[PDB]
Amino acid sequence: DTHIFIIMGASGDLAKKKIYPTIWWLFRDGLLPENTFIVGYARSRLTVADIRKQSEPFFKATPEEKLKLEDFFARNSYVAGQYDDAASYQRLNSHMNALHLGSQANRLFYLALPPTVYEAVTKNIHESCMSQIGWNRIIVEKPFGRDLQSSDRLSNHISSLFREDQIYRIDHYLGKEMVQNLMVLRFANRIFGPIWNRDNIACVILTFKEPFGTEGRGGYFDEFGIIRDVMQNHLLQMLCLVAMEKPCSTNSDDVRDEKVKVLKCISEVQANNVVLGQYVGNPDGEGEATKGYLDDPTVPRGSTTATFAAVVLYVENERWDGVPFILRCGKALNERKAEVRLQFHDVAGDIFHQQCKRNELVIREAVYTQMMTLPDAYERLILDVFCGSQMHFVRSDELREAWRIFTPLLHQIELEKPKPIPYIYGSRGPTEADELMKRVGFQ
Amino acid sequence: QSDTHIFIIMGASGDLAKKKIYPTIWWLFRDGLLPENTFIVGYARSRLTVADIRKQSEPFFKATPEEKLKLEDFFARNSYVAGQYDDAASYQRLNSHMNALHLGSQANRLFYLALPPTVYEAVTKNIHESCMSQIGWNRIIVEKPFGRDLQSSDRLSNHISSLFREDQIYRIDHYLGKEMVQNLMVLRFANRIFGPIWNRDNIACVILTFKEPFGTEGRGGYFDEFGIIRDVMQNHLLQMLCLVAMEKPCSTNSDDVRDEKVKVLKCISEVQANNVVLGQYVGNPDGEGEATKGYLDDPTVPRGSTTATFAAVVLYVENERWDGVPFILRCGKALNERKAEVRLQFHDVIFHQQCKRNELVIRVAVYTQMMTLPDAYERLILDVFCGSQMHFVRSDELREAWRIFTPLLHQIELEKPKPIPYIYGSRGPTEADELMKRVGFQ
Ligand SMILES: NC(=O)c1ccc[n+]([C@@H]2O[C@H](COP(=O)([O-])OP(=O)(O)OC[C@H]3O[C@@H](n4cnc5c(N)ncnc54)[C@H](OP(=O)(O)O)[C@@H]3O)[C@@H](O)[C@H]2O)c1
Ligand SMILES: NC(=O)c1ccc[n+]([C@@H]2O[C@H](COP(=O)([O-])OP(=O)(O)OC[C@H]3O[C@@H](n4cnc5c(N)ncnc54)[C@H](OP(=O)(O)O)[C@@H]3O)[C@@H](O)[C@H]2O)c1
């Protein structure tokens, strides 16, 4: 029953503005397990007072909650420590053992540090802090490398120290309906699976659009680009949920095993199935929509970093083969959308004596077929690791195959630095995206 | 082989010929959808002339002055022969009158049986024995009723199918509106697209609805002899089920798809009296129009009538693909709207929170939803010219159809139960929505 929630880097913005508040909300709605201590670790010489002061801004505290807020802060504590230094972890372990049932408690470690220090911490948590009786679960944060080779080093490290069932790689930086995406597509597989195949579907597009640009933090993004930001992780996860086979059960590792069989059968995307974009500002429109990506302090000058990407993948296997899977995601477009389109073959020529137009299944609140021509993301991902559900967290093999697919392309965008086709903030994207789609059988 | 066509309206004197058949061939001539060389010969006991038939029909033709040139050209090709229905002499005259037309000899002949099915036996016998072209094809259109039950249907069926081949027999049904072939075409399309889904592994409950917003519209006396189950369920709604529940056909031929339809029927068991709710519409005081007037306030409806004007019924397809999957048929006159829709509800179960049953809804693009030029008659007439039997009930399709509803129908005649009062423009009786919940229709 008893749980300890340890935030490493409890001083930083992620802990301050996101982690502390989102476990506040979770405890404030009786969603946390009854007996749950929150514990902060960092270098800074802080107390429970310092950490209410800096972090209650983002809590959205009211007059009626004044009693609960104090019951939450009764169960918090802090511990000074270098991330480099063993005795620091030794002090932390003993702190937790002293707490009520602290010797028997399950332990949930949130790594809210940069991945440069990840090696040191995994090795020290592993050496000194693991429960002898409870479960031990590490929440590791993006980025999980920037390429196959770098992701393979950081990962092979964590996975020599931690079983796969103690590793939770979290992704939440693409909005609060981001888990919802993964649940309806998984549901739409259970309903429509028998129809989702090459004998019924001529084309699939997975669209993920953000209407807003990189709004000042383009200094963190210019290191990564859109393929690493959205495509390699989220779109690919939603591709898998569409192309996978009804799983052997409803257990995390049976569906994860099925998302990987897809990924294994996707070969390395080459550059002439790729259309990259970059958002140049809008003269003709109000708000931050006047600011091109380039025109931002944090973005280096003449940086040829992709803001938009359209890609053609193929899932070379008996179920799908020659069925083009189109991935289309971008910043600073005309709307906020996550849609999958499954365009059928022209199957009604005889019935209606005329040439009838093409049919198509669309998912975005039951969704539809046409004819062309409270728990919110972060909240739900926290509970999932308290509940031991790894459904929505990427696996080791899953993550390697992900990078295997895009890594040759990405190294070519570093070496040869091509120029992203510019496109107006608010527009649908480069029009060479629409052409690529037509040439591969989109309507 | 040839380009010429004779259209023989047996009972051209009659009310169907006047208000529907002449108009609907007129409109087809008006739009050049008929063959270039089409003669139109009417036959009945009445001593009439083309001008007599012109005068009674032309009110229904809704003719404009632009069409007068086209319309003389039409009534030109019109002839009329008087004659009795079991008098061999008479039929001789008709054969001769056709033979005395340009290429009658080797023209295709199309016989519209616009008579009550009491003269069918003699009219069919005599057409076979006398009036059939010997180079051209010979096709018969038979009108409803296709008898009133299995035994009455089988007798007429057997007779006709001892004289004519199944490929000469066209059983036309066209009294349930204009988007009525449409209805059938789109449930076939969706079958093509959603077939692999449509089965007991994936689907909890199937429901096919046929609502009309109006009553018997003064012609209650005709309806009262038949009931809602003979008028809608045993014909058009049972075809909509066949089209949903049937196997990937072995080809895109009439006879192949109709084979697959019959396979579903063969496996449908006799509908049981305690899986049936019957309605009859009483008037709407607060309403206005015909909506003021109930079934029994039709002056042609005999007093004390219990004829069902609405019915819910529950069938099962007992085979592999379906089983413990109730098919619910719900139809009626004088209802809240005009609807022909199929609902397929899936099984209930990712969202760690009871998330409510989903269901696929084909209304006549349509959708999944989380719950809680030509018209029918023109098309069907063309279909017999152009030779397609796709949208016409095959003899054995029809035998099964009667087999399913015949025990219940006879139960209804014997026990004479009191159908439930439902207000004109109502949804139908509540006891219908109860039946559905007990078999799990959400
Ligand atoms: N889209 C994204 O993927 C995205 C967006 C937001 C955040 N993040 C993730 O957030 C994580 C943490 O960021 P944050 O917002 O919490 O702030 P941060 O300032 O990057 O790091 C948080 C804390 O870590 C410690 N720290 C920082 N740099 C360090 C270094 N070089 N060596 C040792 N300790 C160091 C500091 O705590 P003390 O000095 O007090 O010990 C600092 O307050 C990163 O891993 C990043 O990947 C990424
Ligand atoms: N909703 C429906 O299902 C529906 C509705 C309309 C029609 N129908 C069907 O359409 C067919 C014809 O309908 P209708 O309204 O045109 O019928 P009808 O007017 O009663 O019969 C048409 C012609 O048949 C002849 N006739 C009538 N009763 C006869 C009898 N007992 N014996 C011999 N000849 C007789 C008369 O011509 P002569 O005296 O000049 O020979 C009459 O002009 C029927 O089979 C009917 O069931 C179906």
Author numbering:
A (entry chain B): 30 to 393, 398 to 406, 433 to 502
B (entry chain A): 28 to 376, 380 to 394, 399 to 406, 433 to 502
From the publication, what sentences describe this entry?
pmcGlucose-6-phosphate dehydrogenase (G6PD) is a housekeeping enzyme that generates NADPH. G6PD exists as a monomer, homodimer, and homotetramer, with each monomer having three binding sites: one for catalytic glucose-6-phosphate (G6P), one for an NADP+ cofactor, and an allosteric NADP+-binding site. The latter allosteric NADP+-binding site, also known as the structural NADP+-binding site, is important for maintaining long-term protein stability and for promoting oligomer assembly. Oligomerization is central to G6PD function as it controls the activity of G6PD; the monomer is inactive with both the dimer and tetramer being the active forms.
